[PDB]
RNA sequence: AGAACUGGUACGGACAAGGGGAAUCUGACUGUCUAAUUAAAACAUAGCAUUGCGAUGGUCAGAAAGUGAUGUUGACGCAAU
RNA sequence: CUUGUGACGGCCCGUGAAAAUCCACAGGAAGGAAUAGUUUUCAUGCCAGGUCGUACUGAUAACCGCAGCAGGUCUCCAAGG
RNA sequence: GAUGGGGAAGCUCCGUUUCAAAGGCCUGAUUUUAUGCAGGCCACCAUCGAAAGGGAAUCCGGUUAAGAUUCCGGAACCUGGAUAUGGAUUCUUCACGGUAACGUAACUGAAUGUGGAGACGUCGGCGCGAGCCCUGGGAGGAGUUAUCUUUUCUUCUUAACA
């Protein structure tokens, strides 16, 4: 329900010692009339709120998922 | 009366109308004399002579309200206070 | 016969006054050490219309001399009193409109209102809109004062009784005709249930002394002696005279 | 244009209540709705809130006055009379 | 004659320090590029010293005599000049137009005026200036 | 043209029962109750709606931080800015007048 | 708003939707009542007039009270006609 | 069209509730640091939130009129021509 | 509508702050120990009375033979309480910036006092919002098609909270 726009803030937020799960959503969006791009969302289920990070770059999306801690339960959908 | 002296100030000397202008003039030391209407807010009145006391400026109180003072200086609106920057050709500064 | 209407008011079932919207009992400040030895100062905050009362109220704020509080009083506004005006109450107060000088320390011919009949009862006399009291003269020894009431009757009261200087605001209220039962309806809607009034002559004889008959007529004399008992006092009670007033009242 | 001849403000009461009664209310109602000088701010911004309550829209000042006018004749005599005694007793 | 001089004491009537005594250190009648209006460089006190009695001994007095000063640019329209005065010599140099526009030298400018303020208040100097304006 | 109904057990169009018809992600029209509108805080002196202060129902004021309920000036969340200015002006002048009255009073008595 | 043209003179085409005038009696008006035979010319009303009362009071209530209504009231008020 | 709201204007001899509850300010009692404190009106972090009603009709059949009575019974939403 | 009181033979009546000796509030000491002494503080002085007045906090989707703002899934908020970390501030101890209206992530504050909110009529017109109605383009489905009709009907939605 709250937005995070800082990747550094997001990555440390995954180490809050309370979050147990997270999900990754893939969307097909149109930047303009011609080009369809792939949208990815990073949602972390905090104890008190849900934090969503949105990435419009496929390259940055991949670099992030390898950087997620292994102990975190990630859901792909 | 006294308004006839004021009328000559308007046609000859220079002056200011309104509370904000006169205190600015009084602050810079360019004011020689101020005139206060009878119905002026007494708090606004009170700070004026204190300002005048700091600047060593003569003070005179008009025997009339806002409307009478405004008509005294030949203006269609009401004036609560006027300041005399220069007599020009009048005689109010020496008298009263 | 049936209990007539004027008896039935005493029980106070539905005949009590409607007091929801009133802002409070309009009484003078209590008589304490400060007022009977000096004077105290007050500030007029609100000038409020009182429901069921023609005159407006004056809401003056005082300082408690003994504790750090801000005792707030409710006065009856005199004509000429404005918000933010300083109000002086006490024996040594200056004679100005709205002041509460005791009747002993005020010269003759002065106008006062909301006058106390006894010192310390916080105002009894001349409390209606447009009403006032004349001070005729004093009696220095056995301090005691003679005043004129709105009724035209001369009353002599103690010199230490207080009374506010001026005339009660809202005068001339009764000059305008109402023109409408609704205006009367709304007027009495906030005072008490005493309207409309039904003529006794238009009543059954069981309901009123005047009732009954093949023609609407009182029958007996309508001047009722003061010695009559409840249920007979229906009409002109203890009427010294009657009929149209031609000539001076000779009071 | 001139909408009415004599009734003036009392045209809202129509053809009823009687001419004389309509005449008296007209005289009082005009004073009721009129605008008066502000004794403090010197403006045509004094109106009646309720019976006897007259307030200045500017300067936010309220003064107690007549039920239908800012001040009646009796108070004017009283205020002078009070002032007559005041300078009589101080000197 | 103009009275807003480099030693007068005034009262701020508007702003965060409303009702605080200030002493004019550097006047500017004909405004400036940064402030196109008659302004000054007053120095004032934010936390006035507390009352001190005989009972407090040697540490409550020290605690109760703390002074929090401040320096600000203020329009003349937001000041009431007083008939009182308080000379400014030990801290008229530090208070200047370039003392502002970066925080670095602001604090030790406040540090100097803090020393001067308490030093005068330590002696029996200018009681009215150090007395809190009650309203 | 769906017609909505009250979501609670009060069928009377009272002040506490005001509704606002809204459209849900389900595609249907469902009424929702709206709370009574907040009233701006007012000045104690000038009687006007003093600004810079969040306007909520009284109980919610216990939730928000101190910043929303005050201004950084003396009489922050209580009096109007101009109201503060005039009372500061009023204070200094009258207190100064007290010295003026006092020196006059002791002067005139010393003469006699 | 206007103009041509057109029809078995039809056209607010169904629906919807004031009869009017000349006078007399009586109540000024809006309003209220005899639920279940009488809605009126009766009642009320604004206006007018009269009477009582300055509170240790007037009118009225209770068996009594250290009891009550008017009265959070004060003659431009309250009470009775 | 319905409804909410803002700024206004008109009306009064009518000016059109109270309390619980929450907050702010004034005030400066008290407590406070430097080898360490102060702070839970900033963020995050933990736990708990009892008791009672919750079905349906609400009317030419679920209510009262002896009844499955053409009577009576408060209210919300209201498409097109 | 009790109590203190006052009537009445009595069932009970009057009265709700009144001719009353009408109490708890918080801090600290004592760590034989539980709480009396240390204090200070304050003056209404029972209670009941509204499922339409005031009032802390929830929405969406789905599910049953019959329940749902209550159940399931997801996402929030309030009150009360224990707290640990981060942040903030301090050697000028209890923050800074802006001329100003004022701004921020915070940014001591007891007794006492003041203010605000709660908290408010009705009518008329005007502006603005939401929902509904109307309608175009397009993307799907259905109807009529002896003849005509880029046609007729229908779906295209986004809650609380941040
Ligand atoms: Mg009646
Ligand atoms: Mg009969
Ligand atoms: Mg009989
Ligand atoms: Mg008879
Ligand atoms: Mg409710
Ligand atoms: Mg703010
Ligand atoms: Mg804000
Ligand atoms: Mg019948
Ligand atoms: Mg009939
Ligand atoms: Mg009749
Ligand atoms: Mg009586
Ligand atoms: Mg409606
Ligand atoms: Mg209005
Ligand atoms: Mg249910
Ligand atoms: Mg149900
Ligand atoms: Mg149902
Ligand atoms: Mg139904
Ligand atoms: Mg139904
Ligand atoms: Mg039945
Ligand atoms: Mg009882
Ligand atoms: Mg209860
Ligand atoms: Mg309730
Ligand atoms: Mg209400
Ligand atoms: Mg909600
Ligand atoms: Mg159901
Ligand atoms: Mg759930
Ligand atoms: Mg900061
Ligand atoms: Mg309020
Ligand atoms: Mg959205
Ligand atoms: Zn004014
Ligand atoms: Zn203000």
Swiss-Prot record, chain A:
It holds the Pfam family Ribosomal_L38e. Keywords: Cytoplasm, Ribonucleoprotein, Ribosomal protein. GO terms for molecular function: structural constituent of ribosome. Its main location: cytoplasm. It is found in: Cytoplasm. Component of the ribosome, a large ribonucleoprotein complex responsible for the synthesis of proteins in the cell. The small ribosomal subunit (SSU) binds messenger RNAs (mRNAs) and translates the encoded message by selecting cognate aminoacyl-transfer RNA (tRNA) molecules. The large subunit (LSU) contains the ribosomal catalytic site termed the peptidyl transferase center (PTC), which catalyzes the formation of peptide bonds, thereby polymerizing the amino acids delivered by tRNAs into a polypeptide chain. Component of the large ribosomal subunit (LSU). Mature yeast ribosomes consist of a small (40S) and a large (60S) subunit. The 40S small subunit contains 1 molecule of ribosomal RNA (18S rRNA) and 33 different proteins (encoded by 57 genes). The large 60S subunit contains 3 rRNA molecules (25S, 5.8S and 5S rRNA) and 46 different proteins (encoded by 81 genes). Present with 50200 molecules/cell in log phase SD medium. PANTHER family: 60S RIBOSOMAL PROTEIN L38, LARGE RIBOSOMAL SUBUNIT PROTEIN EL38. This is Large ribosomal subunit protein eL38. It comes from Saccharomyces cerevisiae (strain ATCC 204508 / S288c) (Baker's yeast). The gene is RPL38.
Curated annotation (Swiss-Prot), chain B:
One of its GO terms (molecular function) is structural constituent of ribosome. Gene3D superfamilies: 3.30.1330.30. InterPro entries: Ribosomal_eL30-like, Ribosomal_eL30-like_sf, Ribosomal_eL30_CS, Ribosomal_eL8/eL30/eS12/Gad45. There is a cross-link at residues 14, 45, 75 (Glycyl lysine isopeptide (Lys-Gly) (interchain with G-Cter in ubiquitin)). Keywords: Cytoplasm, Isopeptide bond, Ribonucleoprotein, Ribosomal protein, Ubl conjugation. It is found in: Cytoplasm. GO terms for cellular component: cytoplasm; cytosol; cytosolic large ribosomal subunit. It comes from the Eukaryota. SUPFAM superfamilies: L30e-like. One of its GO terms (biological process) is negative regulation of mRNA splicing, via spliceosome. Present with 59300 molecules/cell in log phase SD medium. Belongs to the eukaryotic ribosomal protein eL30 family. Component of the large ribosomal subunit (LSU). Mature yeast ribosomes consist of a small (40S) and a large (60S) subunit. The 40S small subunit contains 1 molecule of ribosomal RNA (18S rRNA) and 33 different proteins (encoded by 57 genes). The large 60S subunit contains 3 rRNA molecules (25S, 5.8S and 5S rRNA) and 46 different proteins (encoded by 81 genes). This is Large ribosomal subunit protein eL30.
Swiss-Prot record, chain D:
The gene is RPL43A. GO terms for molecular function: structural constituent of ribosome; zinc ion binding. GO terms for biological process: cytoplasmic translation. Component of the large ribosomal subunit (LSU). Mature yeast ribosomes consist of a small (40S) and a large (60S) subunit. The 40S small subunit contains 1 molecule of ribosomal RNA (18S rRNA) and 33 different proteins (encoded by 57 genes). The large 60S subunit contains 3 rRNA molecules (25S, 5.8S and 5S rRNA) and 46 different proteins (encoded by 81 genes). Component of the ribosome, a large ribonucleoprotein complex responsible for the synthesis of proteins in the cell. The small ribosomal subunit (SSU) binds messenger RNAs (mRNAs) and translates the encoded message by selecting cognate aminoacyl-transfer RNA (tRNA) molecules. The large subunit (LSU) contains the ribosomal catalytic site termed the peptidyl transferase center (PTC), which catalyzes the formation of peptide bonds, thereby polymerizing the amino acids delivered by tRNAs into a polypeptide chain. It comes from the Eukaryota. Its main location: cytoplasm. The modification Phosphoserine is found at residue 39. GO terms for cellular component: cytosol; cytosolic large ribosomal subunit. A zinc finger (C4-type) spans 38-59. InterPro entries: Ribosomal_eL37/eL43, Ribosomal_eL43, Ribosomal_protein_eL43, Ribosomal_zn-bd. Keywords: Cytoplasm, Metal-binding, Phosphoprotein, Ribonucleoprotein, Ribosomal protein, Zinc, Zinc-finger. Pfam families: Ribosomal_L37ae (PF01780). It is found in: Cytoplasm. The keyword Ribosomal protein applies. Disulfide bonds: none annotated.
Swiss-Prot record, chain E:
The gene is RPL27A. Its main location: cytoplasm. InterPro entries: Ribosomal_eL27, Ribosomal_eL27_CS, Ribosomal_eL27_KOW, Ribosomal_eL27_sf, Translation_prot_SH3-like_sf. It comes from the Eukaryota. Coiled coil: none annotated. Present with 7380 molecules/cell in log phase SD medium. There are 2 genes for eL27 in yeast. One of its GO terms (cellular component) is cytosol. Component of the large ribosomal subunit (LSU). Mature yeast ribosomes consist of a small (40S) and a large (60S) subunit. The 40S small subunit contains 1 molecule of ribosomal RNA (18S rRNA) and 33 different proteins (encoded by 57 genes). The large 60S subunit contains 3 rRNA molecules (25S, 5.8S and 5S rRNA) and 46 different proteins (encoded by 81 genes). Disulfide bonds: none annotated. Signal peptide: none annotated. This is Large ribosomal subunit protein eL27A. GO terms for molecular function: structural constituent of ribosome. It holds the Pfam family Ribosomal_L27e. Keywords: Cytoplasm, Ribonucleoprotein, Ribosomal protein.
């Amino acid at each position: 329900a709250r937005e995070i726009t800082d990747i550094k803030q997001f990555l440390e937020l995954t180490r809050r010692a309370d979050v147990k799960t997270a999900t990754v959503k893939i969307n097909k969006k149109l930047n303009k009339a011609g080009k369809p791009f792939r949208q990815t969302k990073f949602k972390v289920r905090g104890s008190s709120s849900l934090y969503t990070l949105v990435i419009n770059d496929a390259g940055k999306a991949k670099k992030l998922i390898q950087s997620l801690p292994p102990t975190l339960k990630v859901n792909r959908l | 009366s006294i308004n006839q002296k004021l009328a000559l100030v308007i046609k000859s000397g220079k002056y200011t109308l309104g509370y904000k202008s006169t205190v600015k003039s009084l602050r810079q030391g360019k004011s020689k004399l101020i005139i206060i209407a009878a119905n002026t807010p007494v708090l606004r009145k009170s700070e004026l002579e204190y300002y005048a006391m700091l600047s060593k400026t003569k003070v005179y109180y008009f025997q009339g309200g806002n409307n009478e003072l405004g008509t005294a200086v030949g203006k269609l609106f009401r004036v609560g206070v006027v300041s005399i920057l220069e007599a020009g050709d009048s005689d109010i500064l020496t008298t009263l | 016969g049936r209990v007539i209407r004027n008896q039935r008011k005493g029980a106070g079932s539905i005949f009590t006054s409607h007091t929801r919207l009133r802002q409070g009992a309009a009484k003078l400040r209590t008589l304490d050490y400060a007022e009977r030895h000096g004077y105290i100062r007050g500030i007029v905050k609100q000038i409020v219309h009182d429901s069921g009362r023609g005159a407006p109220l004056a809401k003056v704020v005082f300082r408690d001399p003994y504790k750090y509080r801000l005792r707030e009083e409710i006065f009856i506004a005199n004509e000429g009193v404005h918000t933010g005006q300083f109000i002086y109450a006490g024996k040594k107060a200056s004679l100005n409109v709205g002041n509460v000088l005791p009747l002993g320390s005020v010269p003759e011919g002065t106008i006062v209102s909301n006058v106390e009949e006894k010192p310390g009862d916080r105002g009894a006399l001349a409390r209606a809109s447009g009403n006032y009291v004349i001070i005729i003269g004093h009696n220095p020894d056995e301090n005691k004062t003679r005043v004129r009431l709105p009724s035209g009757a001369k009353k002599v009261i103690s010199s230490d009784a207080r009374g506010v200087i001026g005339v009660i605001a809202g005068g001339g209220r009764v000059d305008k005709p109402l023109l409408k039962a609704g205006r009367a309806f709304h007027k009495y809607r906030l005072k008490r249930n005493s309207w409309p009034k039904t003529r006794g002559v238009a009543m059954n004889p069981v309901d009123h002394p005047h009732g009954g008959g093949n023609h609407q007529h009182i029958g007996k004399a309508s001047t009722i002696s003061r010695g009559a008992v409840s249920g007979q006092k229906a009409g002109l009670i203890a009427a010294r005279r009657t009929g149209l007033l031609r000539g001076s009242q000779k009071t | 244009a001139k909408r009415t001849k004599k009734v003036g403000i009392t045209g809202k009461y129509g053809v009823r209540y009687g001419s004389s009664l309509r005449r008296q209310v007209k005289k009082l109602e005009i004073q009721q709705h009129a605008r008066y000088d502000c004794s403090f701010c010197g403006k045509k911004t004094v109106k009646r809130g309720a019976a006897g309550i007259w307030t200045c829209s500017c300067c936010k000042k309220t003064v107690a006055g007549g039920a239908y006018t800012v001040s009646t004749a009796a108070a004017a005599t009283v205020r002078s009379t009070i002032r007559r005694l005041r300078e009589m007793v101080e000197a | 004659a103009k009275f807003l001089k480099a030693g007068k004491v005034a009262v701020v009537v508007r702003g965060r320090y409303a009702g605080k005594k200030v002493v004019i250190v550097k006047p500017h009648d004909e405004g400036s590029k940064s402030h196109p209006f008659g302004h000054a460089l007053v120095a004032g006190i934010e936390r006035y010293p507390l009352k001190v009695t005989k009972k407090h001994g040697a540490k409550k007095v020290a605690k109760r005599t703390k002074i929090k000063p401040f320096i600000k640019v203020v329009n003349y329209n937001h000041l009431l000049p007083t008939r009182y005065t308080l000379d400014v010599e030990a801290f008229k140099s530090v208070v200047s137009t370039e003392t502002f526009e970066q925080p670095s030298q602001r604090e030790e400018a406040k540090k100097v005026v803090k020393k001067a303020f308490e030093e005068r208040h330590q002696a029996g100097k200018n009681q009215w200036f150090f007395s809190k304006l009650r309203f | 043209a769906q017609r909505v109904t009250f979501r609670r057990r009060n069928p009377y169009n009272t002040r506490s029962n005001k509704i606002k018809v809204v459209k849900t992600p389900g595609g249907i029209l469902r009424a929702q109750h709206v709370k009574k509108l907040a009233t701006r805080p007012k000045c104690g002196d000038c009687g006007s709606a003093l600004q810079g202060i969040s306007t909520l129902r009284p109980r919610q004021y216990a939730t928000v931080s101190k910043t929303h309920k005050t201004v950084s000036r003396a009489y922050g969340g209580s009096r109007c800015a101009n109201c503060v200015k005039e009372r500061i002006i009023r204070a200094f002048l009258i207190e100064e007048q007290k010295i003026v009255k006092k020196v006059v009073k002791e002067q005139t008595e010393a003469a006699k």
